[model samples]
Target: EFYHLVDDYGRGNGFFDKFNFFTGDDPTHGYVDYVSRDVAAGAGLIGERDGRTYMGVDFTNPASGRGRRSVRLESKNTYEHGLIVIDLAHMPGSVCGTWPAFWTLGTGDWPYGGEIDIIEGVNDNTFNHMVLHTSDGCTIDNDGFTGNLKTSNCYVYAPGQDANAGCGIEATDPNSYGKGFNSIGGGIYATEITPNGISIWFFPRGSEPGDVLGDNPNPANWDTPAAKFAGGGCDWEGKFNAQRLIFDVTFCGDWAGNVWGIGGCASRAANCVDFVRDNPSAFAESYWLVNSLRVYAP
Candidate 1:
């Protein structure tokens, strides 16, 4: 292991307060109205129950014409290289017009700094899609990673790589994300940011590595990670730096709206936003029930 103890968190001990609440329009053009921390707390969107931290959207309110109420939280501290592990009991999933993500973005010149989508899926999709967005001149080889490569180029606007699509790996296991993930009680998402490269791993609740379960995590002892992005003749450090963690649940927008035709979800409404506005109770389980989040520094 290249890292040692850094930060461990539950809901208490300033964990909830450490995250800065974002109240604004969704940057991805989603139909989401982000709420302030106080508003989120009042609506029970941020809190602890049964010794777990719960962050979720307002399922009880009628979308009723405007965008749905939600929360977008970001950690105050920015990290360049570290091990980030999040133990989630549940995450938003299995619902139409819903797109939830736990991602990281480095500040500076937009795509120059890069963005890493750790857990991202939309519109009842049961797969976790990990993506890295950067400027031109970055690409990934088809080796050293277990997941399916959706795109090989990490450049957000690379030729033949689709618009802003970047390099992405799609997890095929249903239990790795969405409804199947929640049914199995979710899992741990481990992301290692290093000078060499980035690796993302998912371990189901019952199958976590012994070292990780014992709180003495050693990545070298674990099984093959789900997705590993490295060794492609690309400069990983130049693309990703000083990244801040982000967690958000948003209604249909760029991704979910554009892909609404895929899963027969469009048959229910005229458009993605309409279906999202009409179905208030379809997202009863669309929430993040987190057990812990730990960070290790090298």
Candidate 2:
């Protein structure tokens, strides 16, 4: 199944016009002030024309509260070995304080359940971040991986190229950090974890095949998974077992909400609203767009 966040007028009508879900109220817990807006109308999901989908979490609203709010789409069942693929894409030009992410979480418990951030970041754009939130032994640097780019201009040409090259460069860049990767394509990430050990790879669309890490043990290499985790890589074995993929676009709450003191929209609230109002084709309201999400097993 797939989901999309669409742009709807304040007429209180849209995709979320049918469903009801819980949301935060306190700023500390979430940035959106309202309590559980309609799913279709809410920033989380929206449907568009011509088979286009959008997903978004509106932080600009003082009603969503503040905290980690999530919308999940689970597969039929768990598989031992499979590939979770999504013909997915996101708006990389996110402002400060915004923490937009695409990830997965296991069923049952929290830490023990396991969490994989396929794409996540705050403020910095340039690179896409992939991380696993699990029990102990899951350090950010170790569990985390990055994909960088050869140049900044490449992203402007094609989003896919930006994604491919960015991931390739991150594995090799000395700084191999998520923050430094923003120069190319900002928010594109792909990660795979299995019995063979956890492996994470990035593709910055702009980067050429030559830019990829050819034979290094670094995570930059896109060829093999084990090779990606050569260094003090994450110990997937130590983490939980089964995993379920989850994807969502969160607004200001934690990162974007607090980044600029009073949320990122403090000054541009009117402008943002105007941008959507005027450029309906460009903005598509305050929602996220998703094409497809699939899981693979081996």
Candidate 3:
């Protein structure tokens, strides 16, 4: 089946109006101070350049109170199922003390409405991880996908898994995320959410399918997706609904902060919070440049 564009989230298309700036304390307990749209505009943290949308953080001074100054935008519109295509020119870099994500979430209460993490990673991770978080009684099978499954339980408190670990699959391609992704000039992330299941495809710069580059996107002609979640007993219809799109970059948060002493990040500073608080220039590369973001349905 073919898809038709239903929403335009690109620059000059009321992109900023489609979302709300989250100025409250981060739910992840990150050492970040989320600023309002006015604050962000005043500081040049959000703008449009060369017809592209840009969202950035303050990288000129040491962070003091709530930590680094950044922006977290949650989409105003909610959806049950559709095709989301986002063409990005740049993503937050694979730098220490940073956690960037492009994800979807349900309203109501935590875990009850479910959450889908389309693009997410922390610290200097070179690979991308796609995950799902929900309440108990949900699980996914490891099949019909190219990535390797890291966990199988979609439940946030499932036994034998880290708290809130959820179900996750790790993309094998290094260039599919962060620094490596930027080196190859970014790409298009196409996510299809349906009652039957959910699937995601990543096509780097010049490799995108011709159909996807235009108004009609037919995923059937494309290569196997990078990740897929389906065929499990999990209730895709009941577990996920009214999901809102979100994009943000936070520092020394739950995931990034908890793993501060591990990996190469350990050599950078005594801890994640300290490194993020004192090294403002280190985040010069932390930002998102989007060519466009569009939603579609059959």
Candidate 4:
């Protein structure tokens, strides 16, 4: 199933079912609950009168206590292999303590089930981590793996430290990252993972090589290797099996909230949320704006 979080209730309601899929209610402890009115409102999903499709979850909604809200869906039963494409071109930047993620997990127990975080961030942008959480030999630092597969393109920092250096450092030059992505026409980020191996690719909107799935796709041609995937290089297949796809916008918690020392929309947090709270009209006013999520099987 495909999901998109937009301002239009007509469109937003499409995926708004107040279900707590992320809480500890599940046996695996892998799912989280995104059932907070404040988190939902603050995320730009409701409370908009402009009719322009822009009212994300409201972080300031006192009702939900300013936490984060996540929506989960069961993909194991619906798909075997395909592509999951999320169009964040219209998504708003969440605040601190807000832990947003798009990942997948097995149906059984924790660790034994395994989890795949496609898009996840903590306090800052310096550390954009893609991790496989399991009970096996998956250590936080090396996880028994090494090389460029675990490092960021711009900075050569550890897995969890990049957010502290600066989450928007790459966004500063919108040409390379951040909200100014439209200037560069945005890009397609593809991650192909299977029992065999995993591969990730990033293709900017206007680049010549075109999409990452096509033939002769070169990361060198794109602004930055916007797309990337790893499995064989890091023994991903041999370690874990089966996967689920998840997407969400989390607020200050382990990464953003604690790392930046602030709540939603504070200067310390680089106005990531404050900017939207102060100037609600400027931001995209949506938690997620996904165009399509297709999975292909071999």
Candidate 5:
């Protein structure tokens, strides 16, 4: 089905007003001190310039006793089904000791409402990893996508899969995420969540679809999705609801912290905590420069 533009949160569009700052501890257990919007604005962690929305961290200060200062933003509006197109001029780079994510989560508790990790990766990740986390009885087929399926079971506690790994797909294009993504001036990530299920597509800068740029996007004309999850022991309608879009960057927590010494970041520091703590200059590029976020619905 075709979709019509619903809302556009662009540069200088009062975009920051549409989101609420999350100042609590990181749910992923990252060594991050999420600051309030007031603090963030006062410190220039969030700003606007040159047609871009800047959401950044304190790059000038080393880790305090608490943690590094950062921001986590959650959309004020929640949606059940829609197509979300994000134009990013920059995202947290593939810096060592960093973990960044752009995703949608259920308004309720975890897993019960499902999560769609549209763009996520850790230290030095050259490509993106898309995923879905849900309660039991949800799974995705291996075919119908360009990415390599890492897991088929969307269940967070599924046997044989890492806890909370959920159903995942590793992108084949290096330019679709992290450093590779930033090297080429970032790109577009379009994620569609509907009753039928979820699918994700990525278009590098200057190569986006005409319809997408024209504001009349139709998924049918786009190439095969980078990842597609639908029609597998899954009840999409019941599994996902009232999703809140989110953007957060944390350091050495959970995934990145656990894999610290093993993921090519060991040489930088003895551990993720220390590395992220001491190296203030290393995170100068750790930020999100968003061009726009547009939502569409049939």
Candidate 6:
């Protein structure tokens, strides 16, 4: 409950400029054409409407081998052990070939410093999928959480799971993400990362706690969180230091492509790339509408 304001990402006044556009190739090997900052501005891939921020992909472009047009944003500042709260209005979902995510990543070697995926899902998934990627010897216990653990081992190189298959906890409620989320006007997502553990909480629009909506937020005052990761014999300090926030909308990438045929998406096309490449109109609804984001430190 002891949190002091550190940073705030609000609307208007060009606050969108705080993040740098990442024009590099998709590290996940997705069928996406990452656009430069200038190109993104020119294509209206980013903007602020009223008190909300809009970040979306280029649904007008036909996908080529080079990929379809899109924008990826990376925060300029790095953070460690803190509280991150986000209010989302809409998120990309219910569309084939789309993989949207809001997460944080560390610098240096891939899984050494760790990664935290706060909100993520592929294709038509209606529930949010939370995950953590780290070096060897990290396993999360399935207690004091709302979702079910998809994997126990948090190690990217773990033998049981595939490559980069870090531990995961999938929200059991379908309304926790995607189309259903937007239908209810989205919700609040809060993450508390500390040296001892990491915890996540979510409140559907109408059911948010009064403490959360007030000037000061107290996690202790809220109900049980949706997911909690800790106490499985892992060193949280070494694995979760120096992380940068990231927001991206990728298509037909590793996870999406690998699971393309699942969830009735096989009927969309022969493969993920094919569907995303040919059907530009189908993605008209895929985008992110954020109300605000704030960070606090203990």
Where model 6 places Cα greater than 4 Å from the true spot, the runs are: 213-215
Candidate 2: where are CA atoms >4 Å away?
Answer: 1-28, 33-38, 41-45, 57-80, 138-189, 204-235, 257-287
Regions of candidate 1 where Cα sits further than 4 Å from its true position: 64-66, 213-215
Model 3 residue 5 lDDT? 81
For each candidate, what TM-score against the reference?
Answer: 0.96, 0.54, 0.97, 0.57, 0.98, 0.96
Tell me the spans in candidate 4 whose CA falls farther than 4 Å from its real position.
1-33, 36-55, 63-83, 94-97, 123-128, 138-185, 208-235, 262-286
**How high is the CA lDDT of each candidate model?**
0.85, 0.40, 0.89, 0.40, 0.90, 0.84
Compared with the true structure, model 5 gives a TM-score of 0.98
lDDT, candidate 5, at 39: 95
lDDT of 2 by residue, 1-298 (tens): 1111121211113333322333535322333333344453455444453454554443343332233233333333444333444333334234443445555666677556665555655433444454445554433223233343233211112243432121222344422223343333232233455654445554443432342222212223444331133224345555546775544444454444444445444555443323222332322222344433434334
**Candidate 6 — which pairs collide?**
none
lDDT of 1 by residue, 68-181 (tens): 888898988888998889989999987888899999999987788889999998987878999999888888877766789898888989899668888999987888888999
Q: Considering summed lDDT, which 10 consecutive residues are worst modelled in model 6?
A: 211-220
Candidate 6: tens digits of C-alpha lDDT, residues 1-298: 4777787877643556678888888999999988887887788777776668988888887878668788888888778978888888887767888888899998888788899999998898888988999999899888989998898888988899988879888888777888898888889889989998888998888787776644467776778888888984798888888888899988988999889987779898989999889888888767788888888888
Root-mean-square deviation of each candidate, in angstroms?
1.5, 11.9, 1.1, 8.5, 1.1, 1.4
Best by lDDT: 5
Which of 2 and 6 is ahead in TM-score? 6
Between candidates 3 and 4, the one scoring higher on TM-score is 3
The TM-score between candidate 3 and the true structure equals 0.97
Error of 3 at 73 (Å): 0.4
Better of 5 and 6 by TM-score: 5
Show where candidate 3 strays beyond 4 Å.
none
User: In model 4, how large is the Cα lDDT of residue 160?
Assistant: 58
Reference-based lDDT, residue 245, model 2: 52
